[PDB]
Amino acid sequence: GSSGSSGSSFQGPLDATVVVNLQSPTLEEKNEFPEDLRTELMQTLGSYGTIVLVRINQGQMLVTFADSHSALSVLDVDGMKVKGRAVKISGPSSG
């Protein structure tokens, strides 16, 4: 297996930011992320780690955390659904 190697991974932006999007958003969402969802998300996603900053875009949701690993998890568990709505998190990183 790969326990040691895995353990010592160390790889992530000090920023710890990620973009959140909805799979099947409605007019309300298509217009701008809802508050009933935001909080739920901010409080939800936050759980995994710690919300240190957040920025909702006309049609996006750049959430920031304290640690990077957290993002990974949130990126893995992303598959999860909020308010019966499928969420999709991406990596706002590209050089």
Swiss-Prot record:
Protein's cellular compartments: Cytoplasm; Cell membrane; Membrane raft; Presynapse
All residue ranges annotated as the RRM domain in the record: 15-89
Top-level taxon of origin: Eukaryota
Similarity comment text for this entry: Belongs to the synaptojanin family. In the central section; belongs to the inositol 1,4,5-trisphosphate 5-phosphatase family.
Subunit details: Binds to GRB2. Isoform 2A binds to SYNJ2BP/OMP25. Isoform 2B2 C-terminal proline-rich region binds to a variety of SH3 domain-containing proteins including SH3GL1, SH3GL2, SH3GL3 and GRB2.
Reported function: Inositol 5-phosphatase which may be involved in distinct membrane trafficking and signal transduction pathways. May mediate the inhibitory effect of Rac1 on endocytosis.
Official protein name in the record: Synaptojanin-2
Species: Homo sapiens
